[PDB]
Design an enzyme around this catalytic site. Sequence first.
Site, PDB file in Angstrom:
ATOM      1  N   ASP B  61      43.276  21.900  56.477  1.00 48.47           N
ATOM      2  CA  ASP B  61      43.640  20.518  56.781  1.00 48.47           C
ATOM      3  C   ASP B  61      43.773  19.699  55.502  1.00 48.47           C
ATOM      4  OD1 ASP B  61      43.355  21.426  59.363  1.00 48.47           O
ATOM      5  OD2 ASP B  61      41.527  20.258  59.752  1.00 48.47           O
ATOM      6  N   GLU B 177      41.225  18.213  66.185  1.00 53.43           N
ATOM      7  CA  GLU B 177      39.884  17.725  65.886  1.00 53.43           C
ATOM      8  C   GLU B 177      39.585  16.437  66.630  1.00 53.43           C
ATOM      9  OE1 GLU B 177      38.775  19.687  61.589  1.00 53.43           O
ATOM     10  OE2 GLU B 177      39.277  17.565  61.678  1.00 53.43           O
TER      11      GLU B 177
END
Lengths: 263, 263
Positions: B61, B177
Site C-alpha cells: 500500500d 482496509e
Amino acid sequence: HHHHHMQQIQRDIAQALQVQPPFQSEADVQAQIARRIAFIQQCLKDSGLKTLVLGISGGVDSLTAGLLAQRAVEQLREQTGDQAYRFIAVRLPYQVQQDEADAQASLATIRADEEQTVNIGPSVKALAEQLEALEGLEPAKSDFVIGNIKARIRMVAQYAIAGARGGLVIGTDHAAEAVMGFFTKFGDGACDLAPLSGLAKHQVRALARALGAPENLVEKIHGVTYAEIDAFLHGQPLREEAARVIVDTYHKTQHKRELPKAP
Amino acid sequence: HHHHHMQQIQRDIAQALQVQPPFQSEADVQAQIARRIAFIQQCLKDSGLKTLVLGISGGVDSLTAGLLAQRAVEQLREQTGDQAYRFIAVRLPYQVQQDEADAQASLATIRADEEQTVNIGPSVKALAEQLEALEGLEPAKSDFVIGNIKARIRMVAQYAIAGARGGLVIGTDHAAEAVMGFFTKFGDGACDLAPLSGLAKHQVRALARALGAPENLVEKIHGVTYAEIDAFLHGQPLREEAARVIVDTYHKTQHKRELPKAP
Ligand SMILES: NC(=O)c1ccc[n+]([C@@H]2O[C@H](COP(=O)([O-])OP(=O)(O)OC[C@H]3O[C@@H](n4cnc5c(N)ncnc54)[C@H](O)[C@@H]3O)[C@@H](O)[C@H]2O)c1
Ligand SMILES: NC(=O)c1ccc[n+]([C@@H]2O[C@H](COP(=O)([O-])OP(=O)(O)OC[C@H]3O[C@@H](n4cnc5c(N)ncnc54)[C@H](O)[C@@H]3O)[C@@H](O)[C@H]2O)c1
C-alpha cells in the site's frame, strides 16, 4: 450585493458548525446541559464502553467538558448500578505556572472519579531528537512544529489510557475554535466525542458557571477576539474587517474540519 | 427477504467507500493512475504547499502510494519548473526483518527525492513508561495498546516532517482496509490526502504492477481474507458467513470513518 453574499456565507458557516442559538433563558442553558450529558451517555452505550478520558489543562473548555463527563458517569452509575462507569481526568503537566495552578483548581472543581498524570516531555524530546527535519529550522517554525508534536502526543496518551481502560476520548472543540481552526489537526482536534460542539465561547463559559465552576476559572483567559468570533457565529454585528478575517481563516482551515481528502 | 436486504447493505457500503468498479481494461488502470496523480497534484496546488510526506513500510500500500507521489512531484517539477516540489519517503524502522528487507526494496523501487529515517522507539518507550494505565494490563491488551501507540507516533513523526517542510501527509487507506476498520484511529488512519481511497486490495496491487513495482513486492503478504473482502466490495459471490462478518465489522467500526461525534 457584497453585504447580502457575506450574510449568506456567515449563515452557511454557522449551519456547518451547528452553532447553538444564543441562550435566551435559563431553560435554554439547562436544556443544553441535559442534552450534552445525555449525548455523552449515549456514546458510551452505543460503543459498549464504560470509561471516559479527558486531558484537564486548566482552561475553561476542558473544565466544562470534564464537568459534563463527571456528571454523566455519576448518573450512569446511579441509574444502572454498574460501578465500572468512570471518568478519568488526565493531568498533562507543562511549564506555564498559571496554567498548572489553574489545572489544579480545575481538577478540584471536577472531582473526577480518577486522576492520572502523564508527563509527555520525555516522549516529545525523544521524538524530536530523531527528526533530522528539525535540524536547522528557523526558530519560530521550529517552535510551532514542536508545539504541534506536543499536542499530538497528548492525544496519543489519552488514546492509550482509553485503550487500556475500555474508554472513549472526549475532546473540547466548540464552534469558536472550530471556525478558526484553532486546534492541532489530529492533536487536540482528535477525539471520539466532542460534547461542546456548536457552542460559542461565551456559551461554554455559561455552561461552566451553571455546572458549578468558580468564577476565576469560568472567566480564565488571528487578530480577532473571541467576542468577535462569537458575534460572527450568532449573526450579530461586528467589525467588517474581523468578519473578513474569520471567513478567510475558515476557508483556509476547511481541511481540518473534514475527513482526509480522497479522489 | 434476507438476500435482498443484504444486497442493499452491500451496495450502500460500496457507495459509502466509493468503491472503484473492477478494472475491465488497461484503459481503466491507466486512467486511475492518471486520476490519482492529478488528485495528489491538486491537493498540493489547493494547499499552496510543495512537499509530500509518506512512511514507507515495505508493504504494497505505501509502495503504491509512494510511486504515485514520486511521479506526481516529478511531473510538477517538469511542468512548473519549481524545484521545491519534493517527495520525502520516511523510513520508520521496527523489528520485523522481512518488513525491513521489504522496506529497503520498496525504497529502491520508489527512488524518492529524499529519504528520512525516524526511529520512534525512544518516543514510544518514553511515553509508555509514563502511563500508569499500562501497569498490570493483561499482556494481550497491553500489546494492542502499545501497537496503537506506535501507529500514532508514526503519524506524529510524519506530521512533524510535513510541518517542518511545508508538506502534506499521504495516507495509504483503501476500501479493503476501510471496510474492516483495519487501521489505527488517528494513527495510520490520519493523513491529509488518501490517494488509494476506494480501491480494492487487488486493485492496489494492479496499480503497483503498472507503476513498475517488482513482482515480489506487488504480491507481498477478522477471519476473512482480502480476496473475500474484495469480492464483497465488488458485489461478487462470496461465502455468506464472510459477508456477515464484513458487514458486522463495518458497523462496529463506523466511528473510525466519520468525524468525531457531536450532539
Ligand atoms: N504553524 C503555524 O505557522 C501557525 C501560525 C499561526 C497560528 N498557528 C496556530 O497553531 C495551531 C495548529 O495549527 P497549525 O497550522 O500549526 O497546524 P495543524 O497541524 O493543525 O495544520 C497544518 C497541517 O495541515 C496540513 N494541511 C495544511 N493545509 C492543508 C490543506 N489545504 N489540505 C490538507 N492538509 C493541509 C499539513 O499537514 C499542515 O502541516 C492552531 O491553533 C493555529 O491557529 C500556527
Ligand atoms: N485492540 C484490539 O483488541 C484489537 C483486536 C482485533 C484487531 N485489532 C486491530 O487493531 C487495529 C487498530 O484497531 P483497534 O480497535 O486496536 O484501535 P483504534 O484505536 O483504531 O480504535 C478503538 C478506539 O476507538 C474508540 N472507539 C471505540 N468504539 C467507539 C465508538 N463506538 N464510538 C467512538 N469511539 C469509539 C476508542 O478510543 C477505542 O479505544 C485494527 O487493525 C484492528 O483490526 C485490535
